[PDB]
Design a protein around this ligand. Sequence first.
Ligand SMILES: CCCCC/C=C\C/C=C\CCCCCCCC(=O)O[C@H](COC(=O)CCCCCCCCCCCCCCC)COP(=O)([O-])OCC[N+](C)(C)C
Ligand SMILES: CCCCC/C=C\C/C=C\CCCCCCCC(=O)O[C@H](COC(=O)CCCCCCCCCCCCCCC)COP(=O)([O-])OCC[N+](C)(C)C
Ligand SMILES: O=P(O)(O)O[C@@H]1[C@@H](OP(=O)(O)O)[C@H](OP(=O)(O)OP(=O)(O)O)[C@@H](OP(=O)(O)O)[C@H](OP(=O)(O)OP(=O)(O)O)[C@@H]1OP(=O)(O)O
Ligand SMILES: O=P(O)(O)O[C@@H]1[C@@H](OP(=O)(O)O)[C@H](OP(=O)(O)OP(=O)(O)O)[C@@H](OP(=O)(O)O)[C@H](OP(=O)(O)OP(=O)(O)O)[C@@H]1OP(=O)(O)O
Ligand SMILES: O=P(O)(O)O[C@@H]1[C@@H](OP(=O)(O)O)[C@H](OP(=O)(O)OP(=O)(O)O)[C@@H](OP(=O)(O)O)[C@H](OP(=O)(O)OP(=O)(O)O)[C@@H]1OP(=O)(O)O
Ligand SMILES: O=P(O)(O)O[C@@H]1[C@@H](OP(=O)(O)O)[C@H](OP(=O)(O)OP(=O)(O)O)[C@@H](OP(=O)(O)O)[C@H](OP(=O)(O)OP(=O)(O)O)[C@@H]1OP(=O)(O)O
Ligand SMILES: CC(C)CCC[C@@H](C)[C@H]1CC[C@H]2[C@@H]3CC=C4C[C@@H](O)CC[C@]4(C)[C@H]3CC[C@]12C
Ligand SMILES: CC(C)CCC[C@@H](C)[C@H]1CC[C@H]2[C@@H]3CC=C4C[C@@H](O)CC[C@]4(C)[C@H]3CC[C@]12C
Lengths: 571, 574
Amino acid sequence: MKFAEHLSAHITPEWRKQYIQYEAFKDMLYSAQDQAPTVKRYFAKFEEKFFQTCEKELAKINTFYSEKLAEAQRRFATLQNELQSSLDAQHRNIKDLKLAFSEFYLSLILLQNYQNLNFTGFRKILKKHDKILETSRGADWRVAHVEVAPFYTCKKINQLISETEAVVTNELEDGDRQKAMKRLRVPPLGAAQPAPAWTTFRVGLFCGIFIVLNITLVLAAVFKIWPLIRIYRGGFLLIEFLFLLGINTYGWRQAGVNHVLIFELNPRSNLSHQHLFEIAGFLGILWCLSLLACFFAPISVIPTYVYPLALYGFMVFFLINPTKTFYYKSRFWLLKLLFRVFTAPFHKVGFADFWLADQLNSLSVILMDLEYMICFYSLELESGICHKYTYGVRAIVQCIPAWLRFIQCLRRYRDTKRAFPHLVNAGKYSTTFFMVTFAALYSTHKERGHSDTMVFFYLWIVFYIISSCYTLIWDLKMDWGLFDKNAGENTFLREEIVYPQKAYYYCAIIEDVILRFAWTIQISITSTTLLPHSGDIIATVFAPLEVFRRFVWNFFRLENEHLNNCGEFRA
Amino acid sequence: MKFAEHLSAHITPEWRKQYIQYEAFKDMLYSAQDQAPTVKRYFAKFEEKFFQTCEKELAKINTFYSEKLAEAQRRFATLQNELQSSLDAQRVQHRNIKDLKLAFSEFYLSLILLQNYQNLNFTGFRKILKKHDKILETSRGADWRVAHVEVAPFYTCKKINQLISETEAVVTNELEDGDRQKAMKRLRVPPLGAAQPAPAWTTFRVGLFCGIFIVLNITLVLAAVFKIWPLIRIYRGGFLLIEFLFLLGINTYGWRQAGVNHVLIFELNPRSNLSHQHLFEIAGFLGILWCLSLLACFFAPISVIPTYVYPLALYGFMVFFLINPTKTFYYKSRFWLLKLLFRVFTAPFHKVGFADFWLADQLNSLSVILMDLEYMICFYSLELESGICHKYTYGVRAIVQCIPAWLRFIQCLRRYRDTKRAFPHLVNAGKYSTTFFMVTFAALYSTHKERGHSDTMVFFYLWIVFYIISSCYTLIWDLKMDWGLFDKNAGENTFLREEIVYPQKAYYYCAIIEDVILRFAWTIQISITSTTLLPHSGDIIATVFAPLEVFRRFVWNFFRLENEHLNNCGEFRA
Ligand SMILES: CCCCC/C=C\C/C=C\CCCCCCCC(=O)O[C@H](COC(=O)CCCCCCCCCCCCCCC)COP(=O)([O-])OCC[N+](C)(C)C
Ligand SMILES: CCCCC/C=C\C/C=C\CCCCCCCC(=O)O[C@H](COC(=O)CCCCCCCCCCCCCCC)COP(=O)([O-])OCC[N+](C)(C)C
Ligand SMILES: O=P(O)(O)O[C@@H]1[C@@H](OP(=O)(O)O)[C@H](OP(=O)(O)OP(=O)(O)O)[C@@H](OP(=O)(O)O)[C@H](OP(=O)(O)OP(=O)(O)O)[C@@H]1OP(=O)(O)O
Ligand SMILES: O=P(O)(O)O[C@@H]1[C@@H](OP(=O)(O)O)[C@H](OP(=O)(O)OP(=O)(O)O)[C@@H](OP(=O)(O)O)[C@H](OP(=O)(O)OP(=O)(O)O)[C@@H]1OP(=O)(O)O
Ligand SMILES: O=P(O)(O)O[C@@H]1[C@@H](OP(=O)(O)O)[C@H](OP(=O)(O)OP(=O)(O)O)[C@@H](OP(=O)(O)O)[C@H](OP(=O)(O)OP(=O)(O)O)[C@@H]1OP(=O)(O)O
Ligand SMILES: O=P(O)(O)O[C@@H]1[C@@H](OP(=O)(O)O)[C@H](OP(=O)(O)OP(=O)(O)O)[C@@H](OP(=O)(O)O)[C@H](OP(=O)(O)OP(=O)(O)O)[C@@H]1OP(=O)(O)O
Ligand SMILES: CC(C)CCC[C@@H](C)[C@H]1CC[C@H]2[C@@H]3CC=C4C[C@@H](O)CC[C@]4(C)[C@H]3CC[C@]12C
Ligand SMILES: CC(C)CCC[C@@H](C)[C@H]1CC[C@H]2[C@@H]3CC=C4C[C@@H](O)CC[C@]4(C)[C@H]3CC[C@]12C
């Protein structure tokens, strides 16, 4: 029933063009029916055209199946050779070979699903054509040609699957089929797997509680010793980033962007956007409860400062929970990625490391707020000393994410020796160092008149412009790939675009243009004392805008990486 | 991946014992493999016994399929005869055509159920024989499947497919003017039971409403503990309605999980029926509105708006949400509920089915809403002696209290007239009339308390005796007639019946205890609310007890539906 959406959802995105165009055939049949007036000869011509189109589709399917089968056979031969070499050598290598075998099994199951779905679509479309035309020739065509097509009559895929199972059981799992087929089953994949009902209910409950608590917080703030905005901005930004990341995952899944392969995640087990929404909602509930406790201070004995810490500490615990609960696999993966990023020069830079470093570049406000909290606790607990004065440590903390990205680019240059991309990106990140340093120098010299304060102000202005232009150009031309020379119809874009609307691309371009300058202004204001009066308000307003810009950027960067190997993270 | 769960979720509950015993075969195979130590002789003996059991199961499946096929052929013949008679005959005609269409749809659903039985049994046989082959490392299971299972009548007979095709053709040619799509829109049978989960958006909305309701309840409690109109008497009805809807959603979920076919019992459409998630959604939305109204009453942020507008609107919206003509919000279920309510409130003039009696019982458990409505009518009539609407009792109050009992009593009388079977209907009528007697005696005692008639103590004693009488009558009817417990055929389940659908017997014992306690509590609450009785703490007692009455009516719904599914306790089916 309603095979169109079934086909659309169960199609492998990377092979979309190689599947049968069920919607195209439906449109052809409906148009022929509408244009039907000579009637018999017209119907005969339409039948001939439909059969020719079906023959073309069948030939395309057959050739794709043949090439995929040949590739699978070659990969199986290489894997068998590797396994034989490993046996001749006789732990980590065994695990890597097992992962490779799992990937090969997933590819084989994907090919099997492709052929099964193609046959089902052929049968359904021919049945629909027979029903509409009131003729049985469609069934005859299906039986004569489709039923005997090599792609449908070839069981080599099944034999390869069985051989893979036997090899894995005998050699890798030590003769126990129970160990095999677990991690080697390929459960439902893509959008074809509905999210758990309990997960959706939890997501809804958390969003509802978050909304009501936000309404209560606004009402209290309108009707009602410690900087609350500074302390809680980091948590709010983290929750917003998690929610927008869930939206990013949903869009990637809907748009056919194979983010799983790009991020090097397990195709069989993946974190759905619903899980990200659930985590964001729970964290937002905790954040709102802490803020409400701060505003009201229900328990008099417990001091106010316990409420924020108790939240953030819990968050840290939630991230580092040793127990295998609450998304333990994803949490451990995130911990490993964070450790690799913060020790960037000593590890090979994959796509995930660079992406997370960029996210930290966008979320630097959290680190800056942590430094401000440390200063406030150390000194305040001259009034407002941490806010009226700046120092080198503040600038270094601001630049830490840019330092990580710059060192990652240097490591990539060392590994690949390709000057252009990595060195240009390194310069694009060092613009941040220059701008922050000059802003800090100007702020320091403003108090103690050096007679060169205006020189530093001008240098900061030019470096601000340079950094904004550099970042915007890199985002538009390299991260997003837009403004390409191959745009046949998609002006200012590339030749291939996956998202349905180009208006989204144009709006994203405009928002990136505005928000790159906005974020540069926010960094300049926060890292120094440029605007001691309204600096906090502007920074607080701009940080969510920076997160939104970083969300749109993730969308389009993942879309470019999937379409083109812009990051050069894959062979 | 796990055909045991898939089968259990796809077996038609009515034929639960007529399917291959996949779990029993699994347990047998595991036990045989566990005790394996000579060895080949034991393996051969186990194989012989296992295949004897498989042959017995195949024979049972074939017999059941033959009986169902014969019944289907007879039903199709009768339907064809009725259709031919209707065609030869050509407002009553439209109803006859609609009834014929519904009967054809029901027969097609039965045919699809039989086909699903066939497919599931074949797949289970194949999957269990493959498992036996893998466990015993032999290919004899496949040979047995091919030689016997693959040639059994149940698997080789295609009479069901031909009957389906003939039914489709006849419905399209003589009931839809040749429109095959229109016929198939009603004949098609989507997945039934737990086969198809509810929409993700529905679950998300249910969760959102639940969270908002919880937070708003917390806010209301905080406002009442820290921060002209009786708000308890104005919001108790709404709270009880929301609680009853939530417990009804729980009841639907439990019925679906336990296999109790309430769709057939309630005569609901099997191709499209409301799920428990939709009931939770409605309950959560109504609870959100109720909490918002109560918060507005507590705070009254806008001063120009009078506080009495806040409750009214809420309840008004509820009424509007129940009589909304547009086909927007659960319009099918809303119209069905409106028709059922109209039939119940006009019981003697309509045939009493399961739905009408069940809804009348729900009203009986929800009589507090009518009492609160009458109290508010009094308050707006007189109070707007200051508190004259809670210090004296009048006949109208007792009549409004007994209205649900009157409806059930008249339903029982109509059923007795229709069937002429005196025992059940008349005993139930007396059970409901005990309510009239108790309420009347309580009202008489309350009225005579003020004046020294010297007959107030006799009225008190009459109220006491009839209170115990009503409590015992209702409890005995619930335990022995509604739930079908304390039967004679129960040789294993003590104090229960021979067959129990719910997983745990402890549920039944706790339900019995709670039924006793909350039946006594319900009688006390009705006595207190109908008449003065306690003039100071009666309000709080009634407010506390009404949720308990709803909970008792929810447990009773569970067990009554279970008993109806098992046995024809209500005699609403042939
Ligand atoms: C000062 C630093 C601030 C903290 C650092 C910044 C952000 C942290 C949050 C998210 C970054 C990770 C986003 C990855 C997205 C990839 C696409 C995707 O959505 O794919 C998901 C990514 O899921 C993940 O692994 C992690 C997702 C995030 C879950 C949230 C964890 C708690 C967050 C709060 C941290 C509290 C810190 C306190 C504040 C200082 C695939 O999931 P899987 O189940 O295949 O996981 C991999 C399992 N294998 C490897 C076995 C297949
Ligand atoms: C004393 C004051 C009033 C007391 C309370 C009155 C009524 C509430 C009681 C019961 C509601 C019906 C429960 C269904 C039981 C059968 C099991 C089942 O779940 O069956 C459902 C029936 O769904 C329902 O009926 C609707 C469920 C209830 C929704 C509540 C609506 C809002 C009420 C507003 C409050 C009104 C009072 C105003 C305030 C003063 C299956 O749905 P379907 O789509 O298969 O329906 C059949 C439709 N075909 C036959 C055309 C396919
Ligand atoms: O009787 P109708 O008209 O209500 O349904 C018919 C038709 O719908 P129509 O009105 O033309 O649009 C098919 O397409 P559709 O709408 O679902 O949509 P899509 O174009 O695929 O998106 C439908 O599903 P499908 O064959 O395409 O998957 C199929 O149902 P059903 O018997 O279950 O088919 P089986 O799976 O059991 O073979 C019926 O085909 P016929 O048996 O050959 O008459
Ligand atoms: O399955 P592998 O062989 O590829 O890797 C598994 C291996 O860890 P490694 O990589 O070698 O360091 C196991 O440790 P090990 O060698 O002592 O023993 P084993 O012989 O495997 O039992 C570990 O504990 P365990 O679960 O198996 O008992 C398991 O954790 P995980 O399932 O997350 O956690 P749980 O929630 O299930 O507890 C890993 O599963 P994955 O990471 O999903 O692949
Ligand atoms: O676990 P593995 O990998 O070593 O072997 C599994 C495999 O058996 P296989 O080799 O074909 O005979 C499954 O068949 P499959 O989906 O590929 O499909 P096909 O029928 O071939 O198309 C079978 O599922 P199922 O379809 O019968 O439901 C599953 O049974 P299990 O989960 O118990 O579920 P149930 O018996 O309760 O249903 C077996 O697991 P275990 O029995 O636990 O060890
Ligand atoms: O339930 P029913 O079959 O007894 O009655 C149906 C009948 O109207 P009624 O309610 O009896 O007054 C249909 O038209 P009708 O009078 O010419 O009679 P027939 O039954 O064809 O003889 C009407 O079609 P429409 O114009 O809205 O599309 C449909 O409306 P609605 O519920 O919104 O359902 P939807 O079709 O939108 O899903 C009703 O429900 P259903 O057919 O189940 O759907
Ligand atoms: C601020 C002004 C100038 C522009 C604002 C444009 C915003 C609203 C645009 C920029 C990028 C857009 C997103 C780009 C891609 C997707 C994925 C798609 O599957 C759903 C819509 C979604 C999620 C878009 C929603 C709208 C969006 C977020
Ligand atoms: C505190 C005591 C007196 C109350 C009586 C015990 C309560 C907890 C018992 C009485 C009947 C029981 C229910 C009976 C049937 C079902 C259906 C099943 O699929 C899930 C559990 C569920 C929903 C039970 C939950 C527990 C329950 C509600």
